[PDB]
Amino acid sequence: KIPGYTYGETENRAPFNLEDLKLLKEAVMFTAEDEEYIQKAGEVLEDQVEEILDTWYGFVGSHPHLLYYFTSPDGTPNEKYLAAVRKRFSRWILDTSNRSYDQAWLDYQYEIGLRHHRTKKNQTDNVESVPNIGYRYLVAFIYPITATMKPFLARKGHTPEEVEKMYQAWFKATTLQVALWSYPYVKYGDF
Amino acid sequence: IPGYTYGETENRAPFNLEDLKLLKEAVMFTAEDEEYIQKAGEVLEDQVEEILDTWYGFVGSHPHLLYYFTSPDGTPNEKYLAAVRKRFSRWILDTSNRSYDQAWLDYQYEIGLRHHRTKKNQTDNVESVPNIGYRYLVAFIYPITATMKPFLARKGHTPEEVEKMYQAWFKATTLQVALWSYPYVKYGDF
Ligand code: HEM
Ligand code: HEM
Ligand SMILES: [C-]#N
Ligand SMILES: [C-]#N
Numbered sequence: 001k002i003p004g005y006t007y008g009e010t011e012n013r014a015p016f017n018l019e020d021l022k023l024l025k026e027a028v029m030f031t032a033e034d035e036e037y038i039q040k041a042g043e044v045l046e047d048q049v050e051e052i053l054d055t056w057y058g059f060v061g062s063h064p065h066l067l068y069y070f071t072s073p074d075g076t077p078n079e080k081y082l083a084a085v086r087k088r089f090s091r092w093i094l095d096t097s098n099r100s101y102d103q104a105w106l107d108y109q110y111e112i113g114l115r116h117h118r119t120k121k122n123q124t125d126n127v128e129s130v131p132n133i134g135y136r137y138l139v140a141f142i143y144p145i146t147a148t149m150k151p152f153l154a155r156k157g158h159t160p161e162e163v164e165k166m167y168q169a170w171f172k173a174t175t176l177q178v179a180l181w182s183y184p185y186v187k188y189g190d191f
Numbered sequence: 192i193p194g195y196t197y198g199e200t201e202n203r204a205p206f207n208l209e210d211l212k213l214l215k216e217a218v219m220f221t222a223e224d225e226e227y228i229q230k231a232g233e234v235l236e237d238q239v240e241e242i243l244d245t246w247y248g249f250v251g252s253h254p255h256l257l258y259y260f261t262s263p264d265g266t267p268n269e270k271y272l273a274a275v276r277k278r279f280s281r282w283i284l285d286t287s288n289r290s291y292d293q294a295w296l297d298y299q300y301e302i303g304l305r306h307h308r309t310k311k312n313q314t315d316n317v318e319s320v321p322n323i324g325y326r327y328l329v330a331f332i333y334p335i336t337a338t339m340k341p342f343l344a345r346k347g348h349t350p351e352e353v354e355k356m357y358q359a360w361f362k363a364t365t366l367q368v369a370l371w372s373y374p375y376v377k378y379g380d381f
């Protein structure tokens with residue numbers, strides 16, 4: 001077991017439902033075509049996750065105000081916090097590509113939003129760190145997530161057209177998830 | 192353009208140029224993107240009517256999106272759509288041509304306020320739904336980029352150049368929706 005990873009065992013139901021998920025998928029233009037290519041993206045990314053993790057956390061680590069969210073109160077990075085989260089982020093890459101986007105998935109999406117938010121941040125790993133990740137950065141991060149995935153998607157010799165489809169699927173699926181994560185941040189009734 | 196008040200908003204944004212610098216860093220937006228978004232402008236400018244049809248065609252294709260433009264009777268308000276269309280058209284140019292300075296930031300606060308319940312329906316003085324749910328503003332980052340993509344290639348630029356214009360557009364669209372979140376986000380959580 002991955003420490004802290006509680007997919008399918010959240011014991012709180014998400015405040016958004018499967019119909020909400022359907023309508024949100026429509027808003028990010030996500031169809032059965034993207035179901036085919038997000039799973040293909042998984043097949044491509046799964047063997048490269050160590051270098052993907054290094055690239056992603058290298059980006060976070062290169063900006064003081066982003067690495068900030070993993071720091072101890074004294075301003076120094078908490079490497080145990082970073083390492084524990086890294087294992088769950090690694091799993092998230094596989095989940096995004098491999099899970100059915102069903103109620104169990106939606107319950108975990110609510111959980112992931114809660115963990116970035118002050119509601120549950122720092123509780124999973126029992127660490128002491130900054131209390132909230134400003135929402136502005138969750139949205140911002142849609143971009144660098146997609147930009148870090150893009151080069152890796154080419155590395156199994158899929159055609160340019162297939163790589164482009166895998167990248168677009170990833171983009172849709174990343175946007176969809178960050179939308180859902182906004183829930184605990186948004187003024188009640190405005191989501 | 193009716194309702195377009197860029198430069199003359201009379202609220203200062205609650206985020207500042209330092210906040211903008213840090214958020215640009217989070218979406219990997221640099222001077223290179225400033226150059227390529229300007230080029231994207233040059234490419235898109237004379238294609239705006241097709242862009243608009245493609246964009247509002249998508250909104251109009253799903254009842255739960257077209258909803259945000261509807262009158263109480265559930266039918267689209269055509270006055271509202273028409274007036275917004277002109278400002279959206281201008282936004283394509285503003286995104287490409289404006290310096291992302293304080294006046295830009297102030298208008299980004301305003302655009303967020305106008306999607307949000309705070310100022311929605313007020314600019315055009317229409318009776319419509321009170322709030323655009325935030326979930327959709329984030330969602331719409333994707334369709335904005337997928338709408339621009341094919342037009343970015345229509346003036347003969349190489350795939351390498353189209354990709355730079357496209358990535359710049361993506362970054363700049365994500366940056367703006369991040370700022371538009373402000374009025375939606377619980378105080379202290381942004
Ligand atoms: C597209 C946006 C983002 C994605 C896809 C993403 C992905 C993830 C994932 C998959 C996890 C682990 C979830 C789990 O516990 O199973 C996580 C946790 C975490 N992420 Fe992100 N994240 C994003 C935004 C951000 C931002 C902007 C930061 C700021 C540095 C950040 C820093 C963290 C931190 C500090 C945790 C640990 C939260 C906790 O205490 O539980 N994330 N992220
Ligand atoms: C990336 C996301 C989005 C972008 C780039 C965008 C762009 C714009 C722009 C440029 C305007 C005019 C702003 C001005 O007054 O100068 C506007 C207004 C408007 N948009 Fe969006 N928009 C987005 C999300 C959405 C969504 C999800 C909807 C839902 C259908 C929507 C529906 C509307 C409506 C109803 C108005 C008029 C609001 C008012 O009463 O002033 N927009 N949008
Ligand atoms: C988050 N990583
Ligand atoms: C907005 N359109």
